[PDB]
Scaffold this active site. Structure first.
Site, PDB file in Angstrom:
ATOM      1  CB  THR A 266      -0.936   0.097   1.224  1.00 32.16           C
ATOM      2  OG1 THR A 266      -0.188  -0.147   2.422  1.00 32.16           O
ATOM      3  CG2 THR A 266      -2.080  -0.887   1.113  1.00 32.16           C
ATOM      4  CG  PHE A 391      -5.284   5.369   6.415  1.00 28.74           C
ATOM      5  CD1 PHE A 391      -4.155   4.599   6.168  1.00 28.74           C
ATOM      6  CD2 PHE A 391      -5.263   6.715   6.065  1.00 28.74           C
ATOM      7  CE1 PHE A 391      -3.028   5.156   5.581  1.00 28.74           C
ATOM      8  CE2 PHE A 391      -4.140   7.278   5.478  1.00 28.74           C
ATOM      9  CZ  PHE A 391      -3.017   6.497   5.238  1.00 28.74           C
ATOM     10  CB  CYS A 398      -4.727   1.828   8.472  1.00 25.98           C
ATOM     11  SG  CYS A 398      -3.015   1.407   8.079  1.00 25.98           S
TER      12      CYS A 398
HETATM   13  C1  HEM Z   1      -0.822   4.095   2.060  1.00 26.17           C
HETATM   14  C2  HEM Z   1      -0.682   3.232   3.068  1.00 26.17           C
HETATM   15  C3  HEM Z   1      -1.751   2.402   3.696  1.00 26.17           C
HETATM   16  C4  HEM Z   1      -3.095   2.294   3.413  1.00 26.17           C
HETATM   17  C5  HEM Z   1      -3.853   3.037   2.333  1.00 26.17           C
HETATM   18  C6  HEM Z   1      -3.646   1.345   4.332  1.00 26.17           C
HETATM   19  C7  HEM Z   1      -5.007   0.980   4.360  1.00 26.17           C
HETATM   20  C8  HEM Z   1      -5.576   0.127   5.291  1.00 26.17           C
HETATM   21  C9  HEM Z   1      -6.957  -0.176   5.350  1.00 26.17           C
HETATM   22  C10 HEM Z   1      -8.014   0.373   4.413  1.00 26.17           C
HETATM   23  C11 HEM Z   1      -7.141  -1.039   6.386  1.00 26.17           C
HETATM   24  C12 HEM Z   1      -8.467  -1.629   6.838  1.00 26.17           C
HETATM   25  C13 HEM Z   1      -8.681  -3.017   6.225  1.00 26.17           C
HETATM   26  C14 HEM Z   1     -10.076  -3.566   6.450  1.00 26.17           C
HETATM   27  O1  HEM Z   1     -11.015  -2.881   6.928  1.00 26.17           O
HETATM   28  O2  HEM Z   1     -10.297  -4.762   6.152  1.00 26.17           O
HETATM   29  C15 HEM Z   1      -5.866  -1.264   6.969  1.00 26.17           C
HETATM   30  C16 HEM Z   1      -5.633  -2.098   8.029  1.00 26.17           C
HETATM   31  C17 HEM Z   1      -4.353  -2.313   8.517  1.00 26.17           C
HETATM   32  N1  HEM Z   1      -3.187  -1.765   8.098  1.00 26.17           N
HETATM   33 FE1  HEM Z   1      -2.954  -0.509   6.684  1.00 26.17          FE
HETATM   34  N2  HEM Z   1      -2.683   0.892   5.140  1.00 26.17           N
HETATM   35  C18 HEM Z   1      -1.516   1.469   4.837  1.00 26.17           C
HETATM   36  C19 HEM Z   1      -0.262   1.272   5.435  1.00 26.17           C
HETATM   37  C20 HEM Z   1       0.017   0.393   6.484  1.00 26.17           C
HETATM   38  C21 HEM Z   1       1.283   0.185   7.078  1.00 26.17           C
HETATM   39  C22 HEM Z   1       2.574   0.888   6.698  1.00 26.17           C
HETATM   40  C23 HEM Z   1       1.112  -0.777   8.080  1.00 26.17           C
HETATM   41  C24 HEM Z   1       2.105  -1.384   9.011  1.00 26.17           C
HETATM   42  C25 HEM Z   1       3.417  -1.160   9.048  1.00 26.17           C
HETATM   43  C26 HEM Z   1      -0.274  -1.138   8.060  1.00 26.17           C
HETATM   44  C27 HEM Z   1      -0.868  -2.055   8.882  1.00 26.17           C
HETATM   45  C28 HEM Z   1      -2.234  -2.299   8.891  1.00 26.17           C
HETATM   46  C29 HEM Z   1      -2.817  -3.233   9.874  1.00 26.17           C
HETATM   47  C30 HEM Z   1      -2.132  -4.054  10.945  1.00 26.17           C
HETATM   48  C31 HEM Z   1      -4.132  -3.245   9.637  1.00 26.17           C
HETATM   49  C32 HEM Z   1      -5.151  -4.056  10.405  1.00 26.17           C
HETATM   50  C33 HEM Z   1      -5.721  -3.170  11.517  1.00 26.17           C
HETATM   51  C34 HEM Z   1      -6.642  -3.933  12.439  1.00 26.17           C
HETATM   52  O3  HEM Z   1      -7.687  -4.460  11.995  1.00 26.17           O
HETATM   53  O4  HEM Z   1      -6.380  -4.035  13.659  1.00 26.17           O
HETATM   54  N3  HEM Z   1      -0.900  -0.426   7.080  1.00 26.17           N
HETATM   55  N4  HEM Z   1      -4.910  -0.565   6.275  1.00 26.17           N
END
Ligand code: HEM
EC number: 1.14.14.1
Length: 453
Positions: A266, A391, A398
């Site tokens: 992402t 996010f 996120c």
């Molecule tokens: C442009 C960068 C990023 C975008 C657009 C993004 C987007 C998202 C989105 C939309 C979700 C929700 C997923 C869902 O509802 O099923 C999510 C969850 C998550 N993202 Fe990202 N993300 C990004 C970067 C990152 C980075 C750099 C990390 C870790 C180093 C990360 C770790 C996570 C984690 C662990 C979740 C799960 C959260 C939970 O349910 O507890 N993300 N992300």
């Protein structure tokens, strides 16, 4: 009221619509034709795709709806396990990991990671500084080098050394192929057909490669005893305040695999789309470059100076508006409920939030939704609730948002400080889909402004 539905293929229903290498963009086109909601059916399953702020704000009500694992995420769960991204809210390990890891991903924690983020960002700038005249940059490829290295270094004190390589790390070859195999199983007919013996053998080999390499990184850190302040140290020492328990080594591995998927897929896309939009809009490029020169007055950017880059932040949010790199997430109804005062849902009924369509909602954003204007994000309070969700939503939003944005703002700030950019090919946007979106084949020339590091 009868719910709109796209073209069917007999017994296969709508499933052949996803048999395409750009499914999200196809779903976006279907959303333009059918509107704010449409039904989508495959053999033995159904969901509803949402595209308007009006319906999505209700879908984001946590008392009524909770995160669902989509079919793609269920396949990703075979190697991401019960890590934060692929676990259900009601699984014990979700809340445990969430409470443990929240402080490690906060805005204050970014002060700790900053030094190591600059380490990788300087490696990007020096690569581009050292290019010969008329050589070009492969943007997504170079942004991926940076973002992968940053999460590896900041997270677990491991150097992937992607700027020293053409061929990627053995972990990444298995991870990319496992994600491809997860995506390809959506478009598939029969599972146990022995024609897919090689597909299953590779997927299991790729699981074992990721598990063995990551489990070795856990054991090496345990046996070392050294306390390098990073995600892995926090997970080995930290305890959930609620239950009083730490994460066990199996879950820790899954969290690391999850962070590597995230920091590869992402985050590089955001920088890639951001630079694309900057070279396609020279007046916006000018404003951002002016800010970078004015703000980043030292050869090594500080934390305070990255927070000062307001316009670069606006550029990134507008890139997230038009092409959110994790473009869809799934929900399920916690109880029987009525969506929008006209679509009655039963307990367990699923919803998909199509984020790029939410971000083109004309009743929220106006009629110029396809134009790149960072001025939309001038005032964050001016954006209505659940209108801008790159996010995700609520407690399942996120966890890496502050990490991703600090990294992207630092790197894009430095890029604009040190170089002028030319869209030398007049690049036509071509968005390749995997887990995430990328502008495939996006290339530029970076002519140095010759400011020392
Ligand atoms: C442009 C960068 C990023 C975008 C657009 C993004 C987007 C998202 C989105 C939309 C979700 C929700 C997923 C869902 O509802 O099923 C999510 C969850 C998550 N993202 Fe990202 N993300 C990004 C970067 C990152 C980075 C750099 C990390 C870790 C180093 C990360 C770790 C996570 C984690 C662990 C979740 C799960 C959260 C939970 O349910 O507890 N993300 N992300």
């Amino acid at each position: 009221k009868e719910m709109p539905q796209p073209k069917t293929f007999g017994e296969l229903k709508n499933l052949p619509l996803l048999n395409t290498d750009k499914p999200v963009q196809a779903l976006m086109k279907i959303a333009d034709e059918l509107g704010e909601i449409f039904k989508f059916e495959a053999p033995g399953r159904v969901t509803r795709y949402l595209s308007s702020q009006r319906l999505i704000k209700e879908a984001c009500d946590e008392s009524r709806f909770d995160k669902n694992l989509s079919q793609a995420l269920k396949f990703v769960r075979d190697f991401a396990g019960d890590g934060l991204f692929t676990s259900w809210t009601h699984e014990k390990n979700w809340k445990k990991a969430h409470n443990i890891l929240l402080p490690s991903f906060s805005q204050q924690a970014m002060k700790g990671y900053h030094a190591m983020m600059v380490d990788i960002a300087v490696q990007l700038v020096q690569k581009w500084e050292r290019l010969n005249a008329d050589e070009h940059i492969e943007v997504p490829e170079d942004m991926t080098r940076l973002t992968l290295d940053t999460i590896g270094l900041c997270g677990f004190n491991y150097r992937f050394n992607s700027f020293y390589r053409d061929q990627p790390h053995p972990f990444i070859t298995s991870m990319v192929r496992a994600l491809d195999e997860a995506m390809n199983k959506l478009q598939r007919a029969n599972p146990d057909d022995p024609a897919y013996d090689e597909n299953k053998r590779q997927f299991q080999e790729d699981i074992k490669v990721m598990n063995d390499l990551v489990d070795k990184i856990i054991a090496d850190r345990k046996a070392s005893g050294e306390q390098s302040d990073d995600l892995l140290t926090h997970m080995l020492n930290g305890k959930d305040p609620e239950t009083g328990e730490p994460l066990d080594d199996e879950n820790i591995r899954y969290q690391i695999i999850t962070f590597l998927i995230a920091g590869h897929e992402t985050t590089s896309g955001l920088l890639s789309f951001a630079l694309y939009f900057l070279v396609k809009n020279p007046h916006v490029l000018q404003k951002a470059a002016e800010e970078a020169a004015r703000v980043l007055v030292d050869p090594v950017p500080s934390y305070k100076q990255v927070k000062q880059l307001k316009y670069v932040g606006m550029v990134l949010n507008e890139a997230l508006r038009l092409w959110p790199t994790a473009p869809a997430f799934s929900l399920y109804a916690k109880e029987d409920t009525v969506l929008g005062g006209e679509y009655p849902l039963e307990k367990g009924d699923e919803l998909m939030v199509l984020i790029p369509q939410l971000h083109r909602d004309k009743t929220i954003w106006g009629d110029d939704v396809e134009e790149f204007r960072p001025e939309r994000f001038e005032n964050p309070s001016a954006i209505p609730q659940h209108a801008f969700k790159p996010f995700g939503n609520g407690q399942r939003a996120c966890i890496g948002q502050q990490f991703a944005l600090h990294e992207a703002t630092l790197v894009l700030g430095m890029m604009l400080k040190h170089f002028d950019f030319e869209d030398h090919t007049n690049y036509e946007l071509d968005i390749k889909e995997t887990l995430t979106l990328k502008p495939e084949g996006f290339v530029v020339k970076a002519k140095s402004k010759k400011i020392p590091l």
